[PDB]
Amino acid sequence: ILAWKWAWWAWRR
Structure with a gap:
């Protein structure tokens, strides 16, 4: 669950 x-x-992209 590392993330x-x-x-x-x-998302910005």
Whole structure:
């Protein structure tokens, strides 16, 4: 379950 603050910047794209 290591992941969450990463998908963020992925949305901005």
